[PDB]
Design an enzyme around this catalytic site. Structure first.
Site, PDB file in Angstrom:
ATOM      1  N   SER A 111      38.542   8.349  -1.257  1.00  0.00           N
ATOM      2  CA  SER A 111      39.409   9.396  -1.825  1.00  0.00           C
ATOM      3  C   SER A 111      38.640  10.708  -1.859  1.00  0.00           C
ATOM      4  O   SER A 111      38.175  11.141  -0.782  1.00  0.00           O
ATOM      5  CB  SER A 111      40.024   8.964  -3.164  1.00  0.00           C
ATOM      6  N   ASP A 168      49.761   4.978   0.756  1.00  0.00           N
ATOM      7  CA  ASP A 168      49.011   5.881  -0.079  1.00  0.00           C
ATOM      8  C   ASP A 168      49.902   7.042  -0.566  1.00  0.00           C
ATOM      9  O   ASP A 168      50.430   7.784   0.262  1.00  0.00           O
ATOM     10  CB  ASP A 168      47.818   6.405   0.724  1.00  0.00           C
ATOM     11  N   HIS A 212      46.700   3.493  -2.425  1.00  0.00           N
ATOM     12  CA  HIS A 212      45.496   4.319  -2.345  1.00  0.00           C
ATOM     13  C   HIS A 212      44.201   3.529  -2.513  1.00  0.00           C
ATOM     14  O   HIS A 212      43.173   3.952  -1.989  1.00  0.00           O
ATOM     15  CB  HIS A 212      45.605   5.446  -3.372  1.00  0.00           C
TER      16      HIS A 212
END
Length: 264
Positions: free
Chosen positions: A133, A179, A210
């Site tokens: 991320s 995601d 995610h």
């Protein structure tokens, strides 16, 4: 006449999908982290020669636990892996990059410190970057800023800038189909599509949220196979992994596969 970086036995699908590779793993906590919050170092105890090192950074609001399944998994195939906590869980991608590179420098320092657990175990010239991320964005920033890195394999990366066209580091983008935090058409795919100068791959996990490549995920067989294969192929120049690294895995767990400049 040979490849002086090649380690371990010939890979198989089974061996790359297993929880552990051929090498035994040990770990330690970094006593005095320098330039980042905390770290754990994972290493093979019996790789038979020096190995490359990889620094892995969590995401925003997250800690080592989000990404540390990679530690034993990669170390067991012949890498020294540092999983970090950032100075703050709220640190942004560029800060994450700085801290990732600080962590690599500390691995190099530790390998250079007599009587450390990893004394002389690291090939200090062969370094790589991973992370989730915002830490995945940070890994791309690291690659952009440090073309000496041998490989990058961010997961569900997030970053405001999408233009990684200068990157020459072989880069695997692990993406998550579903995601909604770093949606693939705004993050992973623009990053992938921007890169024209390098071996690169887009590996999108079917049904993934995610957190689809985080610790505890249901696809460690495929994701771990691909991440290890990529790092072997590019960190070690290990052509036994060209197939595994560069080819479509033909997996029900993959919703999208793209690659360029990667010969199988």
């Amino acid at each position: 006449g040979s490849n002086p970086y090649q380690r371990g036995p010939d890979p198989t699908t089974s061996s790359l999908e297993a929880s552990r590779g051929p090498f035994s793993v040990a770990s330690f906590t970094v006593s005095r982290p320098s330039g980042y919050g905390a770290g754990t170092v994972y290493y093979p105890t019996n790789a038979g020669g020096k190995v490359g090192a990889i620094a892995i950074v969590p995401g925003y609001t997250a800690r080592q636990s989000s990404i540390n399944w990679w530690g034993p998994r990669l170390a067991s195939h012949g890498f020294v892996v540092i999983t970090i906590d950032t100075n703050s869980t709220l640190d942004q991608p560029s800060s994450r990059s700085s801290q990732q590179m600080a962590a690599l420098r500390q691995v190099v320092s530790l390998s250079g410190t007599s009587s450390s657990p990893i004394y002389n175990k690291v090939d200090t010239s062969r370094l790589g970057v991973m992370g989730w991320s915002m830490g995945g964005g940070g890994s791309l920033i690291s690659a952009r800023n440090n073309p000496s890195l041998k490989a990058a394999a961010p997961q569900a990366p997030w970053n405001s800038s999408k233009n990684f066209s200068s990157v020459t580091v072989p880069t695997l983008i692990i993406a998550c189909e579903n995601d909604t935090i770093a949606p693939v058409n705004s993050h992973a795919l623009p990053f992938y599509n921007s890169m024209s100068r390098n071996p690169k791959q887009y590996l999108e996990i079917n049904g993934g949220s995610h957190s689809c490549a985080n610790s505890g995920n249901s696809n460690q067989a495929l994701i771990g196979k691909k991440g290890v294969a990529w790092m072997k192929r590019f960190m070690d120049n290990d052509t036994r992994y060209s197939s595994f690294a560069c080819s479509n895995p033909n997996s029900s767990s993959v919703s999208d596969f793209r690659t360029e400049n990667c010969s199988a």
